[PDB]
Structures are given as C-alpha cells and as structure tokens.
C-alpha cells in the first residue's frame, strides 16, 4: 500500500467532513432565514381557495347525493349562474428568484474550488473500489504521479463524495424534507381548465350501495371499555 | 310514534354555493402519453451528445441528463403505467 502521512488525517480528512457537514447546516438555516412569504391580496387567495374547493369536490363528490352534485355543477360551469364566467382579471422578483435558485448549488461548487486550492498536492484517502483510469484527471487534481492507482483521491473529489453522501444524514438529523442538499401563476387558464375538466367529470353517489355492503357483516364492538 | 317532534318551519345574502331551485340539469391516450417521454428523451440525449467536450468537462451534467429523461422512466415504470 502507501504509508500516508498521519497528519493528513487530522487536518485534511476530518476538517473536510466537518466543513461539509456544518456548511450544509449553515445553508439550510440561511435558506429558512431568507424565505419570506410574498404578500397576497384578497382576490388571489380567494380564487385559489375556490379552485381548491372545486378540486376537492371533483375528487370526493361521491359521498354527496346526485341533486347536490348537479347543483354544484350548475353553480360552477353554466352561463346562467355566471360563476367561472364573470370571474377573472432587470425586475426585482426575477433577480431574487434566480439568486435563490442559484444559491442551492453554487456555494457547494465554490467551497469545492476553495478546498481544491487550499488542500492541493495531497493524497487524502483511498477510495475502496477500483475506479477507472479514465477518471484520473478529476480525482487526482494537483498530483503529478502517472502510475498511481486510480483509487487514490485528492482533497477536492473527497469533499465532493462527502457532500454527495451527507444529504441522507441531513434528513436524519435536521428534519424531514430539509433544504440542505445538492439536487397558480395564472387563474384564467386555470378557470378554463377547471371548467372543461368538471364538464368531463361524472357523478357516482357512493351511498347507493353502502347499506348492502354494511348489512353483510356485523358491527365491530369489542374494546368498548 | 308518541315523540315525533318536528323542528322545521320558518326559513327566515344567501350563503355562497346555495341555489334554492331544484334544477334538473345533467393505444389511444396511453399511446401519446408513452410516446411523450419516448420522444422527449432523445432531445435531451441529442443535446448531451452534441455537447461533446462540454459533456466531458461536465461529469455531473451527463449523470443528471441520463437520470432525468432516462433511468427515472425505468425507475418509475410502474408509476408511468399507472398514470
């Protein structure tokens, strides 16, 4: 094998892991700090909630009798009722959203570049599987060796492996669906597509056969205590 | 029934969604849905192939491209069929 310097472990192996871990935590906390809810006026939230009600009705109107459902239909999509017909209406926001989208990966690549400069010229760890020789130019940046086994990796790619393999740990400790990783706008068209979709939808009163499917088996009663 | 009490009677804008009058108003797509990814996948594949040295200088981009249009479709084959 290779008699690697022990001091490479205490200052190039562990610090990379610590930096990656706490930079991920920093990124997640900065992401939650930056997020601010955009101000919404009454009309937009009102129409969003209205289409929410329409979609949930389309989903589970089976538990509602037929006359109530077709009255819903009359109210939603019918000339005479009027609803769904008489219901319609470098920039800072683009720069802000582009910067927010950029800040999810670019800080990782900048940290990688800084690590590649700072820790250039080492052999940090041996990747325990035989990587291909054609992968040499990116795993072993800063090394002039030629016959060195491809399984030996410099600092930058070791940090990259660390940042790829630590997202699951982030989900483990930080919380479910954390933001530390590496990876309606228009209502008129929404109104029209809801119109067409709920026109295409049908009715099936799920209570037409509940009694017969209930009469078949006795009612569970144990555990009353 | 000796205790059949009736509690209805007087009914008093109207609540939203209410309407008093009782109105009496009342292969194939799968082929296109499957051919969608079958035609969109080569586009990303063609872009990645035409990248050339750019793709070689971008090891992560190739993996993302091969996992976006392909791989994911194979992984979500059951989901694609169910959709």
């Amino acid at each position: 094998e290779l008699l690697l310097d022990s001091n490479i472990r205490l200052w190039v192996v562990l610090p990379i892991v610590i930096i990656t871990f706490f930079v991920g935590m920093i990124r997640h906390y900065v992401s939650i700090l930056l997020q601010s809810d955009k101000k919404l006026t009454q009309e937009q939230v009102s129409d969003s909630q209205v289409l929410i009600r329409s979609r949930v009705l389309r989903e589970n109107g089976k538990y509602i009798p037929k006359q109530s459902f077709l009255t819903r239909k009359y109210y939603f999509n019918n000339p005479e009722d009027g609803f769904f017909k008489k219901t319609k209406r470098d920039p800072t926001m683009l720069t802000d959203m582009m910067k927010g989208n950029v800040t999810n990966v670019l800080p990782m690549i900048l940290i990688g570049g800084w690590i590649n400069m700072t820790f250039s010229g080492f052999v940090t760890t041996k990747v325990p599987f035989p990587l291909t020789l054609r992968f040499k130019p990116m795993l072993q940046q800063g090394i002039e060796l030629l016959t060195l086994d491809a399984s030996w990796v410099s600092s930058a790619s070791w940090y990259f492996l660390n940042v790829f393999g630590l997202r699951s740990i982030y989900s483990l400790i930080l919380g479910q669906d954390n933001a530390a990783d590496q990876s309606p706008a228009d209502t008129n068209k929404a109104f029209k597509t809801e119109w067409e979709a709920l026109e295409l939808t049908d009715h099936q009163w799920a209570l037409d056969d509940v009694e017969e499917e209930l009469m078949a088996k006795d009612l569970h009663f144990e555990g009353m205590f | 029934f000796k205790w059949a009490i009736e509690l209805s009677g007087p009914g008093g804008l109207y609540p939203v969604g209410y309407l008093d009058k009782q109105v009496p108003d009342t292969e194939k797509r799968c082929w296109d849905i499957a051919l969608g990814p079958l035609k969109q996948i080569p586009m990303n594949l063609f872009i990645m192939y035409m990248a050339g040295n750019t793709i070689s200088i971008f090891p992560t981009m190739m993996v993302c491209m091969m996992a976006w249009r392909p791989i994911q479709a194979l992984m979500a084959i059951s989901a694609t069929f169910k959709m």
């Binding site: 989208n101 950029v102 570049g113 590649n116 940046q141 | 200088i57 981009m61």
Partner: peptide, 16 residues
C-alpha cells in the same frame, strides 16, 4: 479557477 468554470458551466446547463 478552470475547475470552477468547468463545473459551473454544467450548473448553467443544469438550470437550463
């Protein structure tokens, strides 16, 4: 950094 540029060009590609 040549490495930073060569790894941020895919980032622009990843966004697009």
């Amino acid at each position: 950094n040549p490495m930073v540029m060569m790894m941020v060009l895919p980032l622009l590609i990843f966004v697009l």
